[PDB]
Design a protein around this ligand. Structure first.
Ligand SMILES: COC[C@@H](C)n1c(C2CCOCC2)nc2cnc3cc(-c4c(C)noc4C)c(OC)cc3c21
Length: 124
């Protein structure tokens, strides 16, 4: 496999919690971004094989996508909201590191991030 293993969504050794903030991140934040017209390039790990990007996983050390975040939320992987927020932030920063500033994917990421930042502003 020329893709790395995806980021883990279950680990018996990692303690976990359900908090109001994590339920909000699932039911409101992820739910909103997931249903956005531009969600789909972010709904699964970057497939470097399918997309013919042999340098992607030479450059991006900490890959992250909303498919992974959705499973981490549903599977109770997280201890706190900040871990989940960091995963979103990483997904956006990775996009801005790898792609050119004028690229369509960066415009898609920017639209999702604006919605994200507004929902995080409203964290309970
Ligand atoms: C708009 O389509 C772009 C096209 C290349 N693409 C398709 C088509 C589907 C139909 O078959 C042809 C390929 N699927 C995907 C799925 N994920 C993608 C993720 C990124 C991406 C992110 C996010 N961060 O870095 C990168 C890099 C991406 O960036 C150019 C393109 C993706 C992508």
């Amino acid at each position: 496999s020329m893709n790395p293993p995806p980021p883990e969504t279950s680990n018996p050794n990692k303690p976990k919690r359900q908090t109001n903030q994590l339920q909000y991140l699932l039911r409101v934040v992820l739910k909103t971004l997931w249903k956005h017209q531009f969600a789909w390039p972010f709904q699964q790990p970057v497939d470097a094989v399918k997309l013919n990007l042999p340098d992607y996983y030479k450059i991006i050390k900490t890959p992250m996508d909303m498919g992974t975040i959705k499973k981490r939320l549903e599977n109770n992987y997280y201890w706190n909201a900040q871990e989940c927020i960091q995963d979103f932030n990483t997904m956006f920063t990775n996009c801005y590191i790898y792609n050119k500033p004028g690229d369509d994917i960066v415009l898609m990421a920017e639209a999702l991030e604006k919605l994200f930042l507004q929902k995080i502003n409203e964290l309970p």
